[PDB]
Design a binder for these strands. Structure first.
Ligand SMILES: [Mg+2]
Ligand SMILES: [Mg+2]
Ligand SMILES: [Mg+2]
Ligand SMILES: [Mg+2]
Ligand SMILES: [Mg+2]
Ligand SMILES: [Mg+2]
Ligand SMILES: [Mg+2]
Ligand SMILES: [Mg+2]
Ligand SMILES: [Mg+2]
Ligand SMILES: [Mg+2]
Ligand SMILES: [Mg+2]
Ligand SMILES: [Mg+2]
Ligand SMILES: [Mg+2]
Ligand SMILES: [Mg+2]
Ligand SMILES: [Mg+2]
Lengths: 129, 56, 65
RNA sequence: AAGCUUGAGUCUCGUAGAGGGGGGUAGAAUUCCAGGUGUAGCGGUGAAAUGCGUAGAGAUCUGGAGGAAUACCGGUGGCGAAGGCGGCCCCCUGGACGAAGACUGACGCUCAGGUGCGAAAGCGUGGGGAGCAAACAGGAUUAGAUACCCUGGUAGUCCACGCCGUAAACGAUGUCGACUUGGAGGUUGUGCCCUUGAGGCGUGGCUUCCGGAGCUAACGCGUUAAGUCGACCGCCUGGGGAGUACGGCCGCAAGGUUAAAACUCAAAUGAAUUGACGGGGGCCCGCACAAGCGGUGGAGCAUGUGGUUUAAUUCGAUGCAAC
RNA sequence: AAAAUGUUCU
């Protein structure tokens, strides 16, 4: 079954990157949307479009800098079978801050740096490189 | 492979025809196949091999 | 070239021996699909029909009796 | 706590199918029986013999009995959870797939323990028993031949109801879900199209082959993954000891299952590579054979060697490649 | 048809 949606989305993104897909679409979710937004902010995709009313499709437009993928890697750290929650002090950094950790925090989904700045952490949703 | 020589027809020709008919039937081959028992597995393997061969 | 398909038949008839006995050889054996060019489903149906005929003794099993 | 429809199910109509169980029957063939025809072999193998045969075999025709299995179709064809499932017919029966639509509304996925099914062999009681055939016997072969070959041939194979519970039960690949370039097919639906013709354009299901990225130890796998991720379980931790012992549980038993230890080796293994080898395949050759001719091995002598003898019988050469 | 084996360590 579709037992992790975020993970699935990440995988899709990665696959798109691999195969030179201009866009990558999937079933949208609020968390998913947030993640997409975060990614956009950080710089790894162009734009996301949540198209539909009853069944909304999240459609991410992937970037390709100099004929290769921007998303070098995109791993779920937290996952349904083993969740990973980091305190502010514990909070990770992907490639020594040359790459982001999407963390879900009490004040929204955001990159790890942002969380740190705030003075909080939480469920480290995914490392994006 | 039932044959009968028609009116004004050589023996040799008739024989040839009969042979052809037999070949078409696959009688000798069939007999050979039934001379000894092949295990179902073995038969399957043979079939597979044949299939492979056919893929040229 | 499959004839049955062209015709547009739902099922081959065992009673129609004239059609069937083109698809069985002189000895009485059922002719291959690869030779006759019959569709696979049709071929199976045809075979079944032939069998039925044989049972009822319209076609022969073999050319002995 | 309330919802929603994408997941998961339900219904409508069809679809193909060796899916399963039960019961009928069909034809071919083998075997046996009875009878006819007929006559010296048949049978078998590498060749033989055992064996069967002048009491009439084998062959050949007729009639019967039975049992088992279903030629052709038949197809990397189909169906089935896997095991498996193959003549045709019927009765009962499970699943799958498609077409639209309507409904339920996360009801899902996975699953230790547990339960069920589970080839073949085997075992239990009762049937059946043609063919085949462990065991067994004889004949061969052999140096021996407790084998391979032959002739026979019992259990078994068949059925009924139980048990067994394992196989290289393999795709050696757990299940479910998502995603990622393609081609060639196969199979089975279905929508559209002047079917102007066997066609054209799709869209699904299941499935074989090649092959891209990627992965891999390489082999390969490659949209049915061994790619990319996610959920869950199973299992692994050097080889041998050993899937063995002891114990438990299960089994009528066979045994299965669960599963050690000491001791012992520094390997064991996988893939590929160069060779070599093959009583593997292909191509080709040399007095290699074949085709010939003349020898040697027999005799006597010459000569060298071994051996023995000897005070010493100098030392070396010792398969072809010493004598 | 029939053709078994090759003392140890280098
Ligand atoms: Mg509703
Ligand atoms: Mg059995
Ligand atoms: Mg024997
Ligand atoms: Mg003996
Ligand atoms: Mg029994
Ligand atoms: Mg096992
Ligand atoms: Mg197999
Ligand atoms: Mg296994
Ligand atoms: Mg391949
Ligand atoms: Mg044991
Ligand atoms: Mg090897
Ligand atoms: Mg010669
Ligand atoms: Mg001499
Ligand atoms: Mg001499
Ligand atoms: Mg000397």
């Amino acid at each position: 079954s579709m037992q992790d949606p975020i993970a699935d989305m990440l995988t899709r993104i990665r696959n798109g990157q691999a195969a030179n897909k201009a866009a990558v679409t999937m079933p949208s979710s609020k968390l998913k949307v947030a993640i997409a937004n975060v990614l956009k902010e950080e710089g790894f995709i162009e734009d996301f479009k949540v198209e539909g009313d009853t069944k909304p499709e999240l459609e991410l437009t992937l970037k390709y800098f100099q004929g290769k993928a921007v998303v070098e890697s995109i791993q779920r750290v937290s996952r349904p079978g083993l969740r990973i929650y980091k305190r502010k002090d514990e909070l990770p950094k992907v490639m020594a801050g040359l790459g982001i950790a999407v963390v879900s925090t009490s004040k929204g989904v955001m990159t790890d740096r942002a969380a740190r700045q705030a003075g909080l952490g939480g469920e480290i949703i995914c490392y994006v490189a | 492979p039932v044959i009968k020589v028609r009116e004004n027809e050589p023996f040799d020709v008739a024989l040839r025809r009969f042979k052809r008919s037999c070949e078409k039937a696959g009688v000798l081959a069939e007999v050979r196949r039934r001379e000894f028992y092949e295990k179902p597995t073995t038969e399957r393997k043979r079939a597979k091999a044949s299939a492979v061969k056919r893929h040229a | 070239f499959c004839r049955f398909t062209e015709e547009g038949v739902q099922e081959i008839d065992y009673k129609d021996i004239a059609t069937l006995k083109n698809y069985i050889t002189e000895s009485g054996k059922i002719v291959p699909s690869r030779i006759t060019g019959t569709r696979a489903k049709y071929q199976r149906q045809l075979a079944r029909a032939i069998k039925r005929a044989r049972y009822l003794s319209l076609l022969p099993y073999t050319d002995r009796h």
